[PDB]
Ligand binder design. Sequence first.
Ligand SMILES: CC(C)OC(=O)c1cc(NC(=S)OC(C)C)ccc1Cl
Lengths: 414, 539
Amino acid sequence: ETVPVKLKPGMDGPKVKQWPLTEEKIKALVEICTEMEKEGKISKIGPENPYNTPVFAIKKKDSTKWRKLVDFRELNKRTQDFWGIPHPAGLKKKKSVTVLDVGDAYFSVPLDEDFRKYTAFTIPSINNETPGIRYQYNVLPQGWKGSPAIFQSSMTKILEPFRKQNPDIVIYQYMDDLYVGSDLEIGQHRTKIEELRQHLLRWGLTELHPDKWTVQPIVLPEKDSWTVNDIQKLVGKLNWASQIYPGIKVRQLCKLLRGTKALTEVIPLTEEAELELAENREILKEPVHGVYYDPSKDLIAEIQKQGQGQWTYQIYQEPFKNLKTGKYARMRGAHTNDVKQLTEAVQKITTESIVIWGKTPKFKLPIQKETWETWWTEYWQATWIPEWEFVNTPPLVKLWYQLEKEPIVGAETF
Amino acid sequence: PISPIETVPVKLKPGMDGPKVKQWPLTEEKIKALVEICTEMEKEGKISKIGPENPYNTPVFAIKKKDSTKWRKLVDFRELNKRTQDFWEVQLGIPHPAGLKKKKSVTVLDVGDAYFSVPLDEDFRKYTAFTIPSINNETPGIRYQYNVLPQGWKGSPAIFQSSMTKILEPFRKQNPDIVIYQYMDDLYVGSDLEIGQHRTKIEELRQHLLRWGLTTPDKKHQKEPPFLWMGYELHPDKWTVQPIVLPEKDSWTVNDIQKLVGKLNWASQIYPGIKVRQLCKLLRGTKALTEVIPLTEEAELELAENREILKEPVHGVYYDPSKDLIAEIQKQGQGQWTYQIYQEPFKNLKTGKYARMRGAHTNDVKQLTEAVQKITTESIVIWGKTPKFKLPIQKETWETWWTEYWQATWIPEWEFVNTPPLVKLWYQLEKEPIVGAETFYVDGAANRETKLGKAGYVTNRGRQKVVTLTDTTNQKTELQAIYLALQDSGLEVNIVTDSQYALGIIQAQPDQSESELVNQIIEQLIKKEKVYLAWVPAH
Ligand SMILES: CC(C)OC(=O)c1cc(NC(=S)OC(C)C)ccc1Cl
């Protein structure tokens, strides 16, 4: 049967316009949508339905098969609340997690007849030579929030058996995904994962390492000799840095900067200054105190382009009170593409956000709206889509985080 | 004679109610005309005589048009419409000629009073009620209501087009090698069949429409190629740009110069060489549209030069899916870029130029980047594809800029073409302080309230200076400090500042700005052989 879903008090349905798509993408959407139309999942709709939601095709991670994706963001946000599952704190402490797409299970369930209109989407035609192909959902839509929600009973139900068989493992369900975390070694882990998929397949469905991340303090440069400049750069960095650890002091250094000297001129370090330095190195050896995640506050993730394919991010909720800071280096293949690295990055942080807190952070993106919108879809891979804003990177913020500690040699993969 | 097509469910607002505006009183002559026409429509089955039961009303009007000077009719749904539910956006994006394919033949079928062919949602119909006034408000006038899509009513367009889609669905599947395009009351059917086959199919399509009550043209009203598709004349084999006419007068008002510059700008897209600088100039200080501004020799000349250019018909080619899509761009002066998309050399599909983007602070490369994105976006829409790019910039310059810029930026697959002016990096701030070179410790300070300030520097070599400024801001001073610094420094300079804005220049290294000041600085920056900028916290 269908549960009577509604909209939040005084909200209306999305009327978001469809961005243009590449031909290949439109072709697939057409193939894909006719099929679902036939399977009774979606139906063509009339003009009396003025709502709309963006749609697009993404490459199912491996195969040539294109996956249909919809941007329900606006709908999700307008959909009444169900006052999901409480985040299992244990997930983050697992050696290797795996993500699975259980969005498929939704088609099996009917969407309340009255809510369907609000799910209207559209397939655009090149050079606008054909009117758009208007549809809507009859079943639970993938990517909608109400979906993993209504399908909870059936979900828990189908899962239990594997949970009792292997209670050492943890299963988290976010939107269309399923994260599986166990402490079993790779082979035994993935075999068990497959043992799960098999289990999930007899209904109709279908490599993280959480214990290895989130740290890295700020290391300060060390030099044989210091110059007027070296110091100046260093003082500006620490001075900005004081907004986080007020115990950091730069007065003694600033004395060494008394004088109109050549930037390249070497300065001898007074013991007094040298102490001030060491004392700051100690303060930086560990993250700031009193930072506790607040579930009633929006989680935030700001990214900065460090160049050469490198990037830095800070997930926090209050300015300077970071819950996590990290670094991302481009993936093999993205060498001459900024949006690839960026899209890939956004995904990773958003996955870690889920893994650790069970939600998606909002992104402050060091990119231009037009560049993002034009090409992000091309490199996307997740069932979900986080929120974002485009911002101008304050030069210091970047300089600071560029200072994060990197491995001695690295994570040795013999 | 109506149709057997199932209506669309039309509802009010939300919770509003149908219009109840009073019937404008008309003359015996105007009334009698409306009486005539309405009786006609009443029999064709389009409208229906109603009564006292209906409270809703819309005013009916009577104008005589050119075609027959015969009295006609008009109904003001302004209200009904503002109370009618929102429908989905009608195709507001029309095909651009560069995106269409050539057809062996192309026919335009004009589905005339198509609106009055489709049934109205019987429920909603009451809301379309109107009344023919009596000779100066006598006894009750004649009451009616629509049973079909009303001319002027909100839903009519979206609804009619939808209907057309269903109705054409069969025919389309039945003959995939035919291509119809709906727009307004027009169906544009093109194809690659031999003319007889085509003509034949046309007839089938027609008769098919007839099977649904949809009447089609008459030999007298039959449209013929070429077709006027906004600014362009299309021919199934190629398109040609309509020769645009510039008046020659001895009295140009402001409107005249504006509207002119309009048509002029529009042309700048297609036609290479159009300029309006001197024509725009005439607008300076205009006190009225009806104001007459004398054309300076400067203006009279460019106006002339343009007339020469516009006398050349620019001809064009259509989209052929079996060949490459290429786009070449030129930097027509700072901030302006020209682009031309073609598959085969000199045979263009589309051209255009992007206006000088006057803004806060940027550089060529970023500006090229944007032009490229604007193009790509347009391309994706027109052809569902992005063009292989031909750009006047060395890949060496690109790799140097992008790989270090603070903002994520990208350019699809591309290739360098040496067609000067080449876009390049006007300068590059040193990666490290310069050994040997002078070091200017610069500072500017101004009382934001009095707008008085000073600015100067002191070098490690002794040189120093200050300059008092009246009517300035602290930002300017910090900046002027830097200007003077560059002015007096040799070919290599080291400069330190606490200016937050100077930090912005280190990160973005702009080569153009809104402020003449910054610009000047850029000028000096470009002049030096080596410049090192270093920022330090204030005080
Ligand atoms: C802009 C419209 C009104 O003009 C045409 O109908 C028209 C269309 C085409 N080409 C194509 S693909 O035809 C499209 C219908 C797909 C070629 C010449 C003309 Cl004149």
